[PDB]
Amino acid sequence: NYIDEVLNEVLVVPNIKESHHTTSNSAPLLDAAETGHTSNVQPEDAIETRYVITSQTRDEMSIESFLGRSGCVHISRIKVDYTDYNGQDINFTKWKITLQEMAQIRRKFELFTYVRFDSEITLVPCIAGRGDDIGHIVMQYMYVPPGAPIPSKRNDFSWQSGTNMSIFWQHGQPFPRFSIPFLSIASAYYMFYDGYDGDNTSSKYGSVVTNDMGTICSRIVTEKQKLSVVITTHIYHKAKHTKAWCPRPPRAVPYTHSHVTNYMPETGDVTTAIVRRNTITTA
Amino acid sequence: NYIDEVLNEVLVVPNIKESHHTTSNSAPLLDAAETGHTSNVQPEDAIETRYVITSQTRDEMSIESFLGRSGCVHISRIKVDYTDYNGQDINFTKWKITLQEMAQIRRKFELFTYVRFDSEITLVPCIAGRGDDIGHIVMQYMYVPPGAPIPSKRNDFSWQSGTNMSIFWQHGQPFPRFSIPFLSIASAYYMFYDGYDGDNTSSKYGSVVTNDMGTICSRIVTEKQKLSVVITTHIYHKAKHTKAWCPRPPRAVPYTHSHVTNYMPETGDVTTAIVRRNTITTA
């Protein structure tokens, strides 16, 4: 286990045996792919192979090393104000819980229909000094599940978190990180969906009727400062203890908007990664 | 234990067995609620149920995960002064030990008549820079039980704490936290009370005759600085190792003042959460 796990030799690939010639009836190279199945032909079948003892692990080819990597999924921003502190909808951020709001990683999952996981979660606040001294800028992140009082503005009554989670980070002390159970009323997170809100010819349809899972109302606790700032707290996410069901063809068209598939670009012709050739004859 | 405790499957709910029809005498659906007791009827009784093996824990429905969550119960503030340092009743805070001084969490307990617990306790100082440089602002929190010399002003003789508790926090070093035994001369903390100070038709009556448990006189040790500041040290509280006796109906009227029940708003009609319907016939 150790060795196999430390040496990373858990999932090893078979070796390529030796072959000889075959002047025989059964032709393994011939199958009818229309059966929708996949061929089973190998080196040893087609050629006069040798003998290679392999030693490549398919460890890094596991839904956990494919998925289990932290990725920017949101960049909370706060261009503070000292003029009006508090006021409605200010100096505090709130953002709807999701992934589709930012590619590369959105891409990655979407490779599967259903998914399930405990999520890591890390916050990377970066304090840009627009003043001659930033002081001590404390911070409060927290999580507002449904249906819950989402701060109208900066000091509601909801920042008491008498029964909510609020993580606090003060300049110097390291990056806040924490983790989370798999939050869904369903046995798995719906990466997709072919359902709607209802029969209302104006109902919602997508990944989304099934994912109202939160939001995040933010706060820079410290009170009024002299010299201004702007805070940019980056939100990274990692999938630990993941499972996946029914793979899908990757995405080749740059999306737009989340919780939707829509590609149809604003005017520009739909572009894809495929390159053009002069002729099939020369590559 | 582990698994059951790590998997959080300690308190599991029964499953819904299968039923068949009943053309029989005893009618479980009929009971007389006047007995003050509660009915005992189930799915299986009323319908022709199926068979569902459950898997929901009532773990998070425990007086410890209901109560055991940190909540703002006080926000100590100090608008420093450099003009007059010391002086009487300045630059040092003191505040009467309690909870009813701030909702959401006050709400939460009040759900029970009696309560008992060891309390966590955490301090979240936030230093607002009103100057061009905050220096090194050290801090001293401490606790003044009855009857004890409560600092008249900033440097008494009581800040020697020769036999008292004073926690010290210096800008950078993390949030001060500590915990505490259950402090009451009584076997439990009285969330309520129907008693008085005495027969004096001017005696006190409430939660309160039974809770003079302290106060907190504060201090910013550092001496005189140049560039001003304002400190806001937030006081969060968590209940660990809690017990509760005789549940009560929750509160629906926004209170006012602590150690009292009084709702009677200043003029405004007494408002409650109930919504109005046009008709009972349509919901």
Partner: peptide, 19 residues
């Protein structure tokens, strides 16, 4: 060094294993 789930909950733990 391992299996020392310093934290109570299971959701908090390292990347799972392989089998």
């Amino acid at each position: 060094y391992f299996n020392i789930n310093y934290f109570k909950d299971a959701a908090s733990s390292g990347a799972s294993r392989l089998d």
